[PDB]
Every structure is written in C-alpha cells, then in structure tokens.
C-alpha cells in the first residue's frame, strides 16, 4: 500500500517579510517532527548580518552621556540593538554615523559602506538638541545565532571600542500546523504548512532555503 | 545484570566487598595499594623497597586509586588484617 507521490514544496505569500510554505504529502506523524526540525534550524543558524562593536568619539566607555543628547550611551546601545543590517562582508567593515544640531538621529542617518545595507532606516537611535553632536562608527560583521560581547580584553581593541551583543538572526517568528486529512478513511497522509517570517534582512524563501541547505548537508550516511 | 558502571561506580561495591571484611577494610585495602602504584611511577620506594604493579592493564590515564580497585576486583592481591 505504498501510495507513492513525492512530496511537493510550494511557496506562498502573506506579507513581504513572511510567507507560508506548504509541503504535501508524506507519512502520518511526519508534519510535527519535520516542521519543528526546520523551526529549530531557522531560529538559530540563519546567518547575519549584525553589528559587533561601535565607537563614539566623545565617550570612552558605555556608562556616560553625550553633551546635548537625550539618551545616555547605555540606552543608545540598547536602541542600536534593534538594528537589522545585512552585509556580504566576509570581513569586519565599519559603518559611520555623524549627526549635528537639533533633530532626531535614526538608522537612515547611518552611511553604510559599499556592500552593506540598513533595512530599517526609520528606527530611532537618539534625539539631539542645539548642543547635541553625535559621531559614532559601527563595525558590522557576519555570523549566525547570538554571540555575547566580544570583550576587548580577549581581542586586541584597546580602550576606545565598546563591544556590543550581536544578534545574527534574520528570522523573526516561526510556527506551523498540520492537517492530516482522512486519517485511514481510505488512505492516510498528512500535509504541513510553515509560517516563516524575517526581519527584512532576507526573504522567507531564502531563509528556508538556507535552513534546508543546513539540514540537507547535515544528515550524513556513511 | 546491573547494566554497566560509569566511572567511579566501577567496579560495584558488592563485588569488591567479597574481597575484604568490611567496607572500611576495603578502603585501607585500596588506599595503601594506590600509594604503592604511585610510588612505582615515581622512584620507589627510595631505599630498600621496590614498587610493584600495576598488575592489571592500566587505562589511558587511569588514576592509581582506580587501578587498585580493579586489582582488588580481580583478586590479584591478598591482604592480612591486624
């Protein structure tokens, strides 16, 4: 009773950052196991696209303020954590941000070097007034997952740089659901649907493709 | 059976207690032997003494106390209580 019809993976679209994926059909009790097997891979090993360390010329460490700025340095660091960047990179490339006078500093004000791009220029970083001047460069690296601060005592960064927690995870939220139809009514089979969402750094298809390549390369038979 | 022991639990105390009187005698039993083995790896025993063992095939980096326990498990040595 080997009802044989290879599984089929067809794309979909719900928004621009996220799009559904449906795979049908395959053996019962396979949906949940295969769905979470990709989810655990998406939420982890999708490469980024993240900022390592930054340097504010006016400050020497993280626990001080900038004349005229409204947010303290430690609070600007927490605002910069919301940066969703993407870079071909392959090496530490530094970005730059210079703002002056009254206004609001956002991610758009950040000048990305050749090969990198900021995917959320509308994000708020800091609010400057008349006496507010903010010059800050940001080192962007490429990795995956979450890496804690790259303390400049393990590396050779000197007193200027201030390491920052990096988060290389283009994927935002992921779920799935199964709808095995006619469980033994005539012939039994299940079909799963995945809801993948990204941070705009990459598309759901590319992420799922990156996860697929990760699992495919992983299942080794020898 | 008792499946298989992992590390410290090997060998079982029950199979080791049959080789000596009480759990306390077992302690001194293996303790002094461990002192003997470690002397052998060094220069032993200074003047007028020559270290013996390991009698069993030692593990990769097995500890001398762990060796004296396997030796007692195999009856490779006899002791006399005072």
């Amino acid at each position: 009773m080997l009802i044989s019809q290879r599984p089929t993976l067809s794309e979909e679209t719900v928004a621009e950052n996220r799009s559904r994926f449906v795979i049908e059909p395959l053996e019962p009790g396979f949906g949940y196991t295969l769905g979470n097997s990709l989810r655990r891979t998406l939420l982890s090993s999708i490469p980024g696209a993240a900022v390592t360390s930054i340097r504010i010329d006016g400050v020497l460490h993280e626990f001080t303020t900038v004349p005229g700025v409204k947010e303290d340095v430690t609070d600007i660091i927490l605002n910069l954590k919301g940066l969703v960047v993407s870079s071909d990179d392959d090496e530490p490339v530094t970005m730059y941000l210079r703002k002056q006078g009254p206004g609001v500093v956002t991610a758009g004000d950040i000048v990305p070097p050749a090969g990198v791009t900021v995917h959320n220029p509308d994000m708020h970083i800091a609010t400057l007034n008349d006496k507010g001047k903010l010059e800050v460069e940001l080192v962007v690296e490429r990795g995956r997952g979450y890496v804690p601060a790259v303390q400049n005592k393990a590396s050779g960064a000197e007193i200027g740089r201030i390491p920052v927690d990096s988060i290389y995870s283009p994927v935002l939220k992921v779920t799935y659901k199964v709808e095995a139809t006619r469980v033994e009514q005539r012939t039994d089979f299940d079909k799963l649907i995945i809801d993948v969402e990204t941070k705009n750094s990459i598309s759901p298809r590319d992420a799922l493709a990156s996860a697929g390549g990760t699992l495919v390369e992983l299942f080794g038979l020898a | 059976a008792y499946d298989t022991p992992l590390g410290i639990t090997n060998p079982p105390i029950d199979e080791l207690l049959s080789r000596a009187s009480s759990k306390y005698a077992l302690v001194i039993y293996a303790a002094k032997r461990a002192r003997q083995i470690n002397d052998y790896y060094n220069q032993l025993g200074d003047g007028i003494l020559e270290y013996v063992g390991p009698l069993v095939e030692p593990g990769l980096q097995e500890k001398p106390l762990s060796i004296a326990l396997r030796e007692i498990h195999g009856d490779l040595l006899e002791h006399t209580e005072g």
């Binding site: 460490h61 626990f63 303390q151 | -």
Partner: protein, 554 residues
Amino acid sequence: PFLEHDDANRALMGANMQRQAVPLVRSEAPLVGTGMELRAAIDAGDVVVADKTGVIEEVSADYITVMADDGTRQSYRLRKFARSNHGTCANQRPIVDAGQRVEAGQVIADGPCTQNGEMALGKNLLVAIMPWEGHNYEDAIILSNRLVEEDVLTSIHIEEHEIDARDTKLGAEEITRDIPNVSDEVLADLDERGIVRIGAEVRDGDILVGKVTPKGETELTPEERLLRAIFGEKAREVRDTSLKVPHGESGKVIGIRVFSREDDDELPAGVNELVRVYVAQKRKISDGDKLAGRHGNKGVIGKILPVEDMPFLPDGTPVDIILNTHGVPRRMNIGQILETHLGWVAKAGWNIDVAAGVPDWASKLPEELYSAPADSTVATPVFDGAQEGELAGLLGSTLPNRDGEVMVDADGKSTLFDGRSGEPFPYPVTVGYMYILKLHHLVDDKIHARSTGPYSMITQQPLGGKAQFGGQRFGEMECWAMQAYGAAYTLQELLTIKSDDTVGRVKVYEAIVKGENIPEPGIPESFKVLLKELQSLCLNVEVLSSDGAAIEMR
C-alpha cells in the same frame, strides 16, 4: 496584587522580596499592578518631580530645565550611573521633551526602578505553569535565552575600590606606577600616575592602583641575589603594595577620584594621597540567579533553553519562563495564579461584546474596563480589586493576534508545542504574563572557590583574604557526619593539613605538584595553642607518651 488571596506568610515574603529587587537597565512597569506604584515612586525621592508648572526649555541626558509661567527658571541635574549603597546602579532617565508643558508635581525623569512615574521593580514575562522535563523541579525555574539576548533581566552593578597613601613606621607610602617585579603588559592599562585608565577592562587580578611602601632591611636570599646580578635587575628598595581586582570580579572602570596632599584637600593625619576607583558590570540574567514574584514565590534559574526548544503558542511565540506548580494543595499561593491570567488579559485587551445588556458578572464593574486595547495596564488595589466572576468574563474576551487566531481559552490555557520534539503537549497548559523580579542574591557574588590562600595570624586557619579565596567552614556538625561515615582519614585531613598544620599544608601542596603521595598530617596549630592557653591559666599539662614521659611541640 490580589493580596486578599495569599497567606500572610507569602504576603510577608512577597513584601520583603519586593525590596530585594535590583534596578534593571530597561525598567518595565508592571502590567498588572495596584495603586501604590505611582504614589510610592514619587514619594521615595528617587524620581525627578517638577516643582512649578510650566514648559521645558532644554532636555539633555545631563540635566533638564523648565521655564515656568511665573518666569522663574528651575533645573534638575540627573543622577547618571551613580553607585548605590550596595553596588546597585541608580540611573535617571528623562521622560519629557523640549516643548512639553508640564504641571507642578509632575514626573520629569524616571528613577532606577520606575517607568513613567510608577515603581517598576521587575519585568512582564510570558509564563507557562507546566512541569518541563525536571529542569523546573521543586523551586527551580527555566528561562528563554531571549531574556539574555534582549537584556530584559540585565542589571548594572557598580563596585567601589579604595587605596590610601599615608606615613608609616619606617617610611611614607607612595602610590606610583612603577611596580617592583612586573612586566610591561600588566602595567599596560595603567596611566602615568599608576591608576587604571578610565574605560579600561579589568580582569581578576589586574592592577587598579600602583602603591609602593618602604620595606626595611632587605636581607634578601642569596639564590635571589645571584639572579639579580645575572639579569642585571637591581633589587629595588621597597616592597610592592598594589590594589588588584578581587578574585572572581570583572568589569569596566567608570570613574576615578583622586585626593592628594599637594592639592590641599583634607585627609586623616598621615594620609598623603587618596584615590578610589569605581568599576561597573553589566550582569546578564544568569542561571543560578534568584527570581521571585510579588506573592512570595521564589526560586533560582535552573536552566536557560534557547528560544528554539521552548514551549511556544500556535503563533510560534515562545514562552519566557516555565514555572512548575509550586503550590501544593492547602499551600495554595492563589494570588499568583490570578495576576497570571489578568496579565494575559491586560496584554491582549478585551471587549465584553455587550449584546442585550451586559453579563451579570459585569454589573458590579464600572464602565471603563468594558473595552480595553492590547498592552493596557491594570490596577487592582489590595482588598478592593478584581473579583473571580469578573476575571472569567475578561478571559472570555480576548482580542486575537495577527490572522485572528486565539491563543488562550476561557480557562487561561493553551496547547503548547514542545520546541524539541515538535509535537504538541497532550493537555492544554496555563499561560499568561506574570511580573517577576530579580533579587539581590546573584551567582557572581555567591560563587567561591579556594585551593590555597591567606591564613589568619593568631590562628593559622585559612582566612578569607580581603581580595577573596575565603575557605569554607567545616563546623562541628559536619565533623559528626564525617565520624558517622567512619571516614577517619577524610576528617583528619580536613582538621589538619587543610587548615592548622603549619608545615603540613605546605608539604601537601609540594607533594601535589610533584605528584608524590600526600604526607602524614602533623599537629594542628589549634591544639598547640590550646596547651598554651592552659599553661597561661597555670595548668601544667604534659602530652605524655606511652613510654616517652613528657614531650613538647617546639
């Protein structure tokens, strides 16, 4: 919240633990609270209040100025990363903007544990009340790695170190950079005076301030003098006395305060220079730390799973913390369950969907809570708060997420998917949002280890050095347990070579490094002191041998 439901024991416990919380970097206000938050915060004195109605002229991280209609001009300097009495960072945040028109008595800047004027001693987390594969056992807790990645439970902690240069018996202390026997790398982070430069990262043992004090007649060892001439390093005149970071500590240097004598100043007689270094630490919520809610419930962090393998709702929304069912029957701890459900209500809003009147349970309710948007804050004063009937009604009304699916039923439960197996948990699990706190008990402060270290003067027992390395106490009761096992050797080892044996502990360390057998223990110094105390009392005691008559230690 829901004080009328918890037992006096847990309520007392809850109150005590509320004042044990630590200020978080973000400081989020409680989603389900009472009424005192606003009043308690502004009255504590740790929040900036506007004395006179008016408008803001300047808003900067350093200060805030208000142009009152009266014409007067008031300014408020903000505490920025100010160390509290027990190392807790107190940082004030401005909550107002330039053109804002503020009334008298209003809140201008948030304190350490405040948000928008009301106390924020903790964070609102997604909770699931299911036992999870034994990792949340008894009172243990498991957290999502999100709490580390998003710095939700991260709190800054500042430490103060101090050193002094005074006149001594044979010379005057001099705090200088040059250290006797050191490499140029260890002094690489010191400034020209010898104090650690601002913003420098300091590891355990690194030098903070280089102090040097006069040493008497050298009378050095010949084996050392020979190497002196060989390598041409002149045996310096005085001894080394540098201030290093305590063992197990680390962080960045915030500020340095230097009080000199040439600069007149005012120091105790003999003191020439006085400098203090302040070191700060950004503490991620780490496994082992102690969390607790407002109802006396407390427990350590037993594990922290990656957000991937975590019970998650159908949305894919992982839960933040998994709490086992601590409350055994009769023990109850009912108040906790209530705020958890209300937490989900306040997070998702509600709408009674009134049709042909309002349900009988909402009759006692005043209009205002009928409709509420998502993420709304609620206040249920202690004795006069929400009631059981009104709760279940709010449970019925729950605005769906994006796509309109529902995540929680009228029972406050949801079918969670095991993030590891991928298969759902067979039964619906209770989920919600509970306001938990980070307590002062921290792993970094409570972990101690010691191989060798300083020893007291009077009693030669291992003394907890002011840097650290304090030894553990093997009390009288532990000795009883050791005697119970019959482990005579382990007991003797603890009370002799590991403590009072002056020549024993050194020969043991020596024997360990060489790899030799551990020598036989000697006489514990405590006993020798005992005989001396007896003799001083005119008690002629003699340690008689079996055939050796009298003997003495010496």
